[PDB]
Amino acid sequence: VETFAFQAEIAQLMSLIINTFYSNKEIFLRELISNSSDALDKIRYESLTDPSKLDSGKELHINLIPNKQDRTLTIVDTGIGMTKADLINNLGTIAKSGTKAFMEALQAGADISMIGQFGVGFYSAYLVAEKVTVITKHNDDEQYAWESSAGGSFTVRTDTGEPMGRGTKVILHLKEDQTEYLEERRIKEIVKKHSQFIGYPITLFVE
Ligand SMILES: Cc1nc(N)nc2c1C(=O)C[C@@H](c1ccccc1)C2
């Protein structure tokens, strides 16, 4: 298991998300679903010129999986996935995100719901999650598990468990007071409100 420090600005961003008083937390789901949709777009595009890239799975969709026993909400896609390098770069650094613009915008009257405009929607997971675990598989690499409870660090390890073919699974270990997002009616409401036009099937698992 390898432990890494977030780039300073990413740590600052996560701290702002965790510590700012902001009640409209439901937008995290929209942001993760949009990330999944973008990843599905990418594998769809790549497979046009190389259909063998779908050998790891033809189906392009998004699964939402609540588990009240474990207090987790899991968002799974069969999108492009991330290599180890992709994981560390995209989740651990500013990379090509608008991290800087976002934090300046918040100081200038923007609100946290606008996080998606700045390519850092992933971090909105920390509105509702005390820990986030990300399992991912890209065609060009092995399966990896990334994990962080914030506090300035994250871990990465090779994941030799059940192979997932291709895609990304985001596991939200919910804060104690955020269990509403495990409720079928609440999830349906949020999907209908914010993600009704997503171009891929979104299946809400039942328990
Ligand atoms: C391939 C993929 N699939 C999913 N489901 N989600 C993501 C990705 C990425 O590649 C980027 C990653 C990210 C995280 C943090 C900041 C910016 C981008 C989010």
Short mmCIF file of C-alpha atoms and ligand atoms in Angstrom, two decimals:
data_model
loop_
_atom_site.label_atom_id
_atom_site.label_comp_id
_atom_site.label_asym_id
_atom_site.label_seq_id
_atom_site.Cartn_x
_atom_site.Cartn_y
_atom_site.Cartn_z
CA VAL A 1 0.00 0.00 0.00
CA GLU A 2 1.36 3.39 -1.01
CA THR A 3 0.44 6.56 0.86
CA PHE A 4 0.55 9.94 -0.89
CA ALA A 5 -0.04 13.55 0.11
CA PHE A 6 -2.60 15.52 -1.89
CA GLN A 7 -1.19 18.51 -3.73
CA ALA A 8 -1.56 21.49 -1.38
CA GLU A 9 -4.38 23.13 -3.35
CA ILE A 10 -6.33 19.85 -3.46
CA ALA A 11 -6.02 19.48 0.32
CA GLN A 12 -7.28 23.06 0.66
CA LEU A 13 -10.22 22.33 -1.64
CA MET A 14 -11.21 19.21 0.28
CA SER A 15 -10.97 21.07 3.59
CA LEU A 16 -13.26 23.79 2.21
CA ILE A 17 -15.80 21.17 1.10
CA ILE A 18 -15.70 19.38 4.46
CA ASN A 19 -15.68 22.45 6.72
CA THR A 20 -17.84 25.03 4.94
CA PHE A 21 -21.42 25.20 6.23
CA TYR A 22 -23.50 24.26 3.19
CA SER A 23 -26.83 22.44 3.37
CA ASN A 24 -27.41 21.64 -0.34
CA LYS A 25 -25.33 18.44 -0.19
CA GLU A 26 -27.44 16.40 -2.64
CA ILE A 27 -25.45 17.73 -5.63
CA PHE A 28 -22.65 15.22 -5.00
CA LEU A 29 -24.67 12.54 -6.83
CA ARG A 30 -25.15 14.69 -9.92
CA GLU A 31 -21.39 15.29 -10.03
CA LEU A 32 -20.39 11.63 -9.73
CA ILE A 33 -23.00 10.62 -12.29
CA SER A 34 -21.65 13.27 -14.70
CA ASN A 35 -18.12 11.93 -14.17
CA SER A 36 -19.37 8.44 -15.00
CA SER A 37 -21.15 9.75 -18.10
CA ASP A 38 -17.95 11.47 -19.27
CA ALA A 39 -16.00 8.24 -18.75
CA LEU A 40 -18.59 6.28 -20.73
CA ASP A 41 -18.34 8.86 -23.53
CA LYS A 42 -14.61 8.25 -23.68
CA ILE A 43 -14.70 4.45 -23.96
CA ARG A 44 -17.54 4.74 -26.48
CA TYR A 45 -15.39 7.04 -28.62
CA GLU A 46 -12.23 4.93 -28.35
CA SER A 47 -14.09 1.76 -29.32
CA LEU A 48 -15.26 3.30 -32.60
CA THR A 49 -11.74 2.92 -33.99
CA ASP A 50 -10.78 -0.09 -31.85
CA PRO A 51 -13.75 -2.36 -30.98
CA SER A 52 -11.41 -4.69 -29.07
CA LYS A 53 -11.44 -2.10 -26.28
CA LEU A 54 -14.90 -3.45 -25.45
CA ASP A 55 -13.56 -6.97 -24.91
CA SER A 56 -13.61 -5.94 -21.24
CA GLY A 57 -17.35 -5.27 -21.48
CA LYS A 58 -19.80 -4.07 -24.14
CA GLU A 59 -22.42 -2.54 -21.85
CA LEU A 60 -22.22 1.20 -21.12
CA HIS A 61 -24.20 2.08 -18.01
CA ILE A 62 -24.25 3.47 -14.48
CA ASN A 63 -25.31 1.56 -11.35
CA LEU A 64 -26.31 3.13 -8.03
CA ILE A 65 -26.01 0.75 -5.10
CA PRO A 66 -27.19 1.64 -1.58
CA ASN A 67 -26.27 -0.56 1.37
CA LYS A 68 -27.83 0.39 4.70
CA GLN A 69 -25.93 -2.36 6.53
CA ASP A 70 -22.53 -0.95 5.54
CA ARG A 71 -23.83 2.63 5.30
CA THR A 72 -22.40 3.00 1.80
CA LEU A 73 -23.67 4.41 -1.47
CA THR A 74 -21.76 3.08 -4.45
CA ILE A 75 -21.71 4.58 -7.94
CA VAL A 76 -20.45 2.15 -10.57
CA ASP A 77 -19.79 2.75 -14.25
CA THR A 78 -18.40 0.70 -17.12
CA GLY A 79 -16.57 3.74 -18.48
CA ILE A 80 -12.95 4.17 -19.52
CA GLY A 81 -11.53 3.62 -16.04
CA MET A 82 -8.22 4.97 -14.75
CA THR A 83 -4.66 3.67 -14.94
CA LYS A 84 -2.53 3.96 -11.80
CA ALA A 85 -1.03 7.16 -13.22
CA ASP A 86 -4.51 8.53 -14.01
CA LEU A 87 -5.57 7.84 -10.42
CA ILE A 88 -2.69 9.61 -8.75
CA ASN A 89 -2.69 12.55 -11.19
CA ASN A 90 -6.43 13.18 -11.40
CA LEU A 91 -7.43 12.47 -7.81
CA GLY A 92 -4.26 13.67 -6.10
CA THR A 93 -3.31 16.86 -7.99
CA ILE A 94 -4.85 19.90 -9.70
CA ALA A 95 -3.90 18.37 -13.05
CA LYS A 96 -6.37 19.74 -15.62
CA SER A 97 -9.03 20.75 -13.08
CA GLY A 98 -10.18 24.27 -12.27
CA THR A 99 -9.26 23.91 -8.58
CA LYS A 100 -7.77 27.41 -8.41
CA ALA A 101 -10.66 29.07 -10.25
CA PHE A 102 -13.18 27.32 -7.99
CA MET A 103 -11.60 28.50 -4.75
CA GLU A 104 -11.34 32.05 -6.09
CA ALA A 105 -14.98 31.91 -7.25
CA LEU A 106 -16.16 30.89 -3.78
CA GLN A 107 -14.43 34.01 -2.45
CA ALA A 108 -16.27 36.05 -5.09
CA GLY A 109 -19.84 34.94 -4.44
CA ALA A 110 -20.06 31.54 -6.13
CA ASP A 111 -21.50 28.60 -4.22
CA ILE A 112 -20.39 24.99 -3.83
CA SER A 113 -23.14 23.72 -6.15
CA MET A 114 -21.14 25.22 -9.03
CA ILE A 115 -18.23 22.84 -8.39
CA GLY A 116 -18.87 20.94 -11.63
CA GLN A 117 -18.10 24.02 -13.73
CA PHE A 118 -14.52 23.67 -12.49
CA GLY A 119 -13.73 20.01 -13.19
CA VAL A 120 -13.50 19.03 -9.52
CA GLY A 121 -16.99 17.60 -8.98
CA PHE A 122 -15.49 14.38 -7.64
CA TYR A 123 -14.54 16.10 -4.39
CA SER A 124 -18.19 16.93 -3.65
CA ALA A 125 -18.32 13.31 -2.45
CA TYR A 126 -16.87 14.69 0.79
CA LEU A 127 -20.08 16.64 1.38
CA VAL A 128 -21.66 13.36 2.47
CA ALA A 129 -18.79 10.85 2.82
CA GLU A 130 -16.30 10.47 5.68
CA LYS A 131 -14.29 8.12 3.47
CA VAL A 132 -14.27 7.48 -0.26
CA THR A 133 -12.92 4.30 -1.82
CA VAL A 134 -12.35 4.17 -5.58
CA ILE A 135 -11.87 0.90 -7.43
CA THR A 136 -10.93 1.32 -11.08
CA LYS A 137 -9.84 -0.72 -14.08
CA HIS A 138 -8.55 0.71 -17.37
CA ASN A 139 -7.78 -1.49 -20.39
CA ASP A 140 -4.12 -0.46 -20.26
CA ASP A 141 -3.47 -1.32 -16.61
CA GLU A 142 -4.26 -3.55 -13.63
CA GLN A 143 -7.12 -2.92 -11.20
CA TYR A 144 -6.41 -0.36 -8.49
CA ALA A 145 -7.97 0.80 -5.23
CA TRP A 146 -7.65 4.46 -4.17
CA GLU A 147 -8.90 5.60 -0.77
CA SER A 148 -9.03 8.74 1.36
CA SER A 149 -10.70 10.03 4.49
CA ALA A 150 -9.24 13.41 3.56
CA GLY A 151 -6.89 14.93 6.13
CA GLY A 152 -4.29 15.53 3.45
CA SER A 153 -3.47 12.01 2.30
CA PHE A 154 -4.70 9.13 0.17
CA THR A 155 -3.62 5.54 -0.45
CA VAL A 156 -3.26 3.47 -3.60
CA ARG A 157 -2.87 -0.31 -3.81
CA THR A 158 -3.25 -2.95 -6.49
CA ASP A 159 -6.67 -4.55 -6.12
CA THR A 160 -6.51 -8.32 -6.61
CA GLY A 161 -10.11 -8.88 -5.49
CA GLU A 162 -12.98 -9.48 -7.90
CA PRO A 163 -11.93 -8.08 -11.27
CA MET A 164 -14.51 -5.59 -12.55
CA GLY A 165 -13.75 -5.82 -16.28
CA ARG A 166 -13.46 -2.09 -16.93
CA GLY A 167 -14.73 1.05 -15.27
CA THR A 168 -14.83 2.81 -11.93
CA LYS A 169 -16.60 2.06 -8.66
CA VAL A 170 -16.90 4.98 -6.23
CA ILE A 171 -17.74 3.80 -2.70
CA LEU A 172 -19.09 6.51 -0.39
CA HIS A 173 -18.78 5.65 3.28
CA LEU A 174 -21.45 8.05 4.47
CA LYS A 175 -21.22 10.34 7.47
CA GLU A 176 -23.56 9.34 10.30
CA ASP A 177 -26.02 12.18 9.64
CA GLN A 178 -26.16 11.64 5.86
CA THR A 179 -28.00 8.31 5.66
CA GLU A 180 -30.88 9.88 3.72
CA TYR A 181 -28.85 9.14 0.58
CA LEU A 182 -29.37 5.41 1.14
CA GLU A 183 -33.15 5.79 0.85
CA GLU A 184 -34.74 4.72 -2.44
CA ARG A 185 -37.14 7.69 -2.55
CA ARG A 186 -34.34 10.17 -1.87
CA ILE A 187 -32.03 8.77 -4.54
CA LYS A 188 -34.83 8.70 -7.13
CA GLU A 189 -35.69 12.32 -6.31
CA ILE A 190 -32.11 13.46 -6.83
CA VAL A 191 -31.63 11.54 -10.08
CA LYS A 192 -34.90 12.89 -11.48
CA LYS A 193 -34.00 16.43 -10.43
CA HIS A 194 -30.37 16.63 -11.60
CA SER A 195 -29.59 13.69 -13.89
CA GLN A 196 -32.75 12.95 -15.89
CA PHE A 197 -31.09 13.50 -19.29
CA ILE A 198 -27.91 11.46 -18.78
CA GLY A 199 -27.25 9.52 -21.98
CA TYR A 200 -26.72 6.13 -20.32
CA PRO A 201 -28.98 3.85 -18.27
CA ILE A 202 -28.90 4.61 -14.54
CA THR A 203 -30.05 1.62 -12.50
CA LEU A 204 -30.92 2.05 -8.84
CA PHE A 205 -30.38 -1.28 -7.10
CA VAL A 206 -32.88 -2.31 -4.45
CA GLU A 207 -31.77 -3.86 -1.17
C1 LIG B 1 -12.38 7.90 -15.66
C2 LIG B 1 -13.16 8.46 -14.53
N1 LIG B 1 -14.27 7.80 -14.19
C3 LIG B 1 -14.98 8.31 -13.18
N2 LIG B 1 -16.14 7.62 -12.83
N3 LIG B 1 -14.67 9.40 -12.48
C4 LIG B 1 -13.55 10.04 -12.83
C5 LIG B 1 -12.77 9.60 -13.86
C6 LIG B 1 -11.55 10.32 -14.24
O1 LIG B 1 -10.79 9.85 -15.07
C7 LIG B 1 -11.33 11.65 -13.59
C8 LIG B 1 -11.75 11.60 -12.14
C9 LIG B 1 -11.43 12.92 -11.50
C10 LIG B 1 -11.31 13.00 -10.14
C11 LIG B 1 -11.00 14.20 -9.54
C12 LIG B 1 -10.82 15.33 -10.30
C13 LIG B 1 -10.95 15.25 -11.66
C14 LIG B 1 -11.25 14.05 -12.26
C15 LIG B 1 -13.22 11.27 -12.04
#
